[PDB]
Design an enzyme around this catalytic site. Structure first.
Site: not given
Ligand SMILES: *Cc1c(COP(=O)(O)O)cnc(C)c1O
Lengths: 807, 157, 157
Positions: A345, A536-537, A542, A644, A648
């Site tokens: 990954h 996200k994180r 980011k 991912t 969404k």
């Molecule tokens: C889908 C999802 C992620 C993945 O987010 P990316 O920044 O695209 O890696 C992270 N956390 C939650 C809660 C999600 O549903």
């Protein structure tokens, strides 16, 4: 319906006989449990039948090994995969309760953390929907990672006590417990190698059902809890025992612990899942109905390594086969390579997992021996194919030299696997040509791509039933299991009725999420404003800061000309910061500090609102994603493998503002780049800026809107009481910014203006949305899993057909 | 002690007191208590700091000679020691650990350990409390000794 | 469990809950705190017991059926559990030990351990405090409830 009556009767039965309560003493939590049991009973029939079916028909079994399973909440998914949602809604109403209230009492399973964990959960749902004989294996983390709380605008980590009141979904299997060995010493005897004087931790299994969508398959997620074996002692021996008991049990305490030999705890966790799982896989293999004998093992068993965390699977499979099962070394190795496959990954080789050999000398002396033997035989082969190439041997070796010898776990995964995949087309090319360049030269066929995906049930049917129905009315129900059928929506961009229907769904979702927002955060939300979402994180790469600068620029623009017509925005930024990440915690504080100024300014009013979404989890993603107009996917180009979350937003009716990296690339290619708001530096441009040298000062100096924004942050305009609060943010953006925030600010601003001009035209906004949704079908985890099954596992989906059960 | 092994720095323990220090004189008789933790109570007889853990500060004196004059001054360096001594199994382990945490106050300079920061604070207070009690004791034990008004004329810190 | 090995008694551990007890129902929601140690302060608002260690009493209920009548009474048995959670190396070990000493309150009947006598006293108080808090809570939570004057008419211990 007879169904509504059955749920009602089962709920009361569970309330009386299972909970040993009546309606006078019962709490809403008891009601959630009573319902959760009622619903689980419908799975059990299929779960038993599924396992009876795999035992009878002995199919090839898929084992997905991950240290993360970001499962979220189970009640809604379970109800929908069994078709009982409507019957439960009515039954619960007739009982005097509210289904959605009960849904909110359920805890988010503290089993995952981010992308890697959610990927695992989407995969498990797909494998069950496709009828694969699939088993998820991981750790049952008692306290998750942590629940984020925002106190005085800063992140506070609160313990995730998610098992406090119990988990109704799981079944304890104390009878299927296995020992895990640690420490000890190794002795070469005439009867084979023996691993002696080991400390033993017990792995207690808990099984959770994984239901298939509108099929009869219910698979298993098997999660292990660490327990110490019980029992002579002096005062010191007693304290040693109590500590070893505690250190045993903290193996399954929290995900990604910190503790600085809490690194040793990570290694213990990694081995604990590996040893527990491999013993279980083998026991299942030899306990088959009607069972030298290990030659069929690669035909009955696939082990998928989700990152290098379960890497020890290679030398541990080798250990069990050779030291316990008395299989010949060479045979065991050819069996190992054919059973194991590895998914990477990450980008760039320095992110890859390494352990010091000294740590292995102490904790796993037998695995170290096996690793050394695997490596030597591997380098003899390399030496045969490329004679005299001394640097090739050093690059390709699993053991690295430096301030101490280290074991490169990624190299071990490549050597011990028949297949190696990346998670997006270009990332997989980097995996091949850069990360494992030398391995690719020797075996190109090993290397593959398996573009990530999301489950259409959770990330559409569950979180967005409104959109799901509007699509169901026009193209029927078949897209829910064959998402590429959404391309039939393409001609409907002309249909005036469909456009106003898709827009109506979005606004319904926006209104429902506004109600959650106003109740929880106490900010007046404008219903006609554009929902700008960045979840996200919290990390420098980011670039939430890039989004922060945009927001400050907009605040300043409203202040300069308050009479001017401005596109209203609700900017939502969410995500968890790693507890020891000073910059990321500063960033969370910046967002809340900005919001405090913006949201309370009377000149600004209903034009701009900034909210930090507290505790971004799976369950919250399901509320916010369906309500989003704009998706921020703004990482520096070259940093993201896939993503991912991107997927969404695309499925739920949001347009994407992003860079040309990760998932965004394949999303552009699927829907046409003109339907996406692509901006900023390209991967090659980032490289070209590193050749020139990035001087962020030049940007700050000659971009007035940026200079004003940075000066406010620096001078304490957003932090009046502590004006040097963001000093390290500013210092970083001017001198150490590796993620080129300033370099992309102008391009990002211009791109947001194009977003503003499109939102100004509702019809053309929603037309572009329909084009996104119609071209998202590729990003179904069904597609990804069918790909893994055919190109890696050598299993065919729907070759196993579980028949209706018996009660 | 820095060692270079294979071109890299390795940290080796500086066992400099292994064989003893001939220069220093132990003064176990001039030992002072250092208080930690506890709670504070405002009473009519003044503020009281109660239920404290006590670490003992044991002084060692080293001569500091003047060049071609007759002055030999003192360097006074404090070693952390736990007071000695009822107990259950847990109380016994608590005591052994507190003994060790007491003695590691004077173990190494600038320790790392991440509440080894708490150990730095303990070290800081240990020298402060030990020293100030010694300065005051010396002040009031002067040949022929309201009385603290001359303190800034007899003491510089 | 008594075993006879070579004609002598050997004590084997009675792991009777290993596979679970089907009869009992856990009531984690009716848990009560038990206080130990601490100190006592006389204030104008009444006597206060402060700085106490807390052990949690988790109730498990077992049915006690009447013979050929419809009465099924309750046996309520308490399990000792430590409350969960900052710490230095010593504070961490103190916590792990207090957790273990909490949980060994409900480990074995009549323990030996020689301040395993202190463990007997702890066991005695653990049942007393758990139970009395439960009796009182039941008394004041009656359907329609100075008020303690009827207590000896509604409660026998
Ligand atoms: C889908 C999802 C992620 C993945 O987010 P990316 O920044 O695209 O890696 C992270 N956390 C939650 C809660 C999600 O549903």
């Amino acid at each position: 319906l007879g169904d509504v009556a059955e749920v009602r009767k089962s709920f009361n039965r569970h309330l009386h006989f299972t909970l040993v309560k009546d309606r006078n003493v019962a709490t809403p939590r008891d009601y959630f449990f009573a319902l959760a049991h009622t619903v689980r009973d419908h799975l059990v029939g299929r779960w038993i039948r599924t396992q009876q079916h795999y035992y009878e028909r002995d199919p090839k079994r898929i084992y997905y090994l991950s240290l993360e399973f970001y499962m979220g909440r189970t009640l809604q998914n379970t109800m929908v995969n069994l078709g009982l949602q409507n019957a439960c809604d009515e039954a619960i109403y007739q009982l005097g309760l509210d289904l959605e209230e009960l849904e909110e009492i359920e805890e988010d399973a503290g089993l995952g953390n981010g992308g890697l964990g959610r990927l695992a959960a989407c995969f498990l749902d797909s494998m069950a929907t496709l009828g694969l004989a699939a088993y998820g294996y991981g750790i049952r983390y008692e306290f998750g990672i942590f629940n984020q709380k925002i106190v005085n605008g800063w992140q506070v980590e609160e313990a995730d006590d998610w098992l406090r009141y119990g988990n109704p979904w799981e079944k304890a299997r104390p009878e299927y417990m296995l020992p895990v060995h640690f420490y000890g010493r190794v002795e070469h005897t005439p009867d084979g190698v023996k691993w002696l004087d080991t400390q033993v931790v017990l792995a207690m299994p808990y099984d959770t059902p994984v239901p298939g969508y509108k099929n009869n398959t219910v698979n298993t997620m098997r999660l292990w809890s660490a327990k110490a074996p019980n029992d002579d002692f002096n005062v010191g021996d007693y304290i040693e025992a109590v500590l070893d008991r505690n250190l045993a049990e903290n193996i399954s305490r929290v995900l990604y612990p910190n503790d600085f030999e809490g690194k040793e705890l990570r290694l213990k966790q990694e081995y604990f899942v590996v040893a527990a799982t491999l013993q279980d896989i083998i026991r299942r293999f030899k306990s088959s109905k009607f069972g030298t004998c290990f030659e069929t093992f690669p035909d009955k068993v696939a082990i998928q390594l989700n990152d290098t965390h379960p890497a020890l699977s290679i030398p541990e499979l080798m250990r069990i086969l050779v030291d316990v099962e008395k299989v010949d070394w060479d045979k065991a190795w050819e069996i190992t390579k054919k059973t194991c496959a590895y998914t990477n990954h990450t980008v760039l080789p320095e992110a890859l997992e390494r352990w010091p050999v000294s740590m292995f000398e102490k904790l796993l002396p037998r695995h170290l021996e096996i690793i050394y033997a695997i490596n030597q035989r591997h380098l003899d082969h390399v030496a045969a194919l490329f004679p005299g190439d001394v640097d090739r041997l050093r690059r390709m070796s699993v053991i690295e030299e430096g301030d101490c010898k280290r074991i490169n776990m990624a190299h071990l995964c490549v050597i011990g696997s028949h297949a190696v995949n990346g998670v997006a087309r270009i990332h997989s090319e980097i995996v091949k040509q850069s990360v494992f360049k030398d391995f690719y030269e020797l075996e190109p066929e090993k290397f593959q791509n398996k573009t990530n995906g999301i489950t259409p049930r959770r990330w559409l049917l569950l979180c967005n039933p409104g959109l799901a129905d509007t699509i169901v009315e026009k193209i029927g129900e078949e897209f829910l299991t064959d998402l590429s059928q959404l391309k039939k929506l393409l001609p409907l961009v002309s249909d005036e009725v469909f456009i106003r229907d898709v827009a109506k769904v979005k606004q319904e979702n926006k209104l429902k999420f506004s109600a959650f927002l106003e109740k929880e955060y106490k900010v007046k939300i404008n219903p006609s404003s554009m929902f700008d979402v960045h979840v996200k994180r919290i990390h420098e790469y980011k670039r939430q800061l890039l989004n922060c600068l945009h927001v400050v620029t907009l605040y300043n623009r409203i202040k300069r000309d308050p009479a001017k017509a401005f596109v209203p925005r609700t900017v939502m930024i969410g995500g968890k910061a790693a507890p020891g990440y000073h910059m990321a915690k500063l960033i969370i504080k910046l967002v809340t500090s900005i919001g405090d100024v913006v949201n309370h300014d009377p000149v600004v009013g209903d034009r701009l609102k900034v909210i930090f979404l507290e505790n971004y989890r799976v369950s919250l993603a399901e509320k916010v994603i369906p309500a989003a107009d704009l998706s921020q996917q703004i990482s520096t180009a070259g940093t993201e493998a896939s993503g991912t979350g991107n997927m969404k937003f695309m499925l739920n009716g949001a347009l994407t503002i992003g860079t040309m990296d990760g998932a965004n690339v394949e999303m552009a290619e699927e829907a046409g780049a003109e339907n996406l708001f692509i901006f900023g530096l390209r991967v090659e441009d980032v490289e070209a800026l590193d050749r020139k040298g990035y001087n962020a000062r030049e940007y700050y100096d000659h971009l007035p809107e940026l200079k004003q924004a940075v000066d406010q942050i620096s001078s304490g305009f957003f932090s009046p009481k502590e004006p040097d609060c963001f000093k390290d943010i500013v210092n970083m953006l001017m001198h150490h910014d590796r993620f080129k925030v300033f370099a992309d600010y102008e391009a990002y601003m211009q791109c947001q203006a194009q977003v503003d001009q499109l939102y100004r035209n509702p019809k053309e906004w929603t037309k572009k949305v329909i084009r996104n949704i119609a071209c998202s079908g590729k990003f179904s985890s069904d597609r990804t899993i069918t790909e893994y099954a055919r190109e890696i596992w050598g299993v065919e989906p729907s070759d196993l057909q579980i028949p209706p059960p018996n009660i």
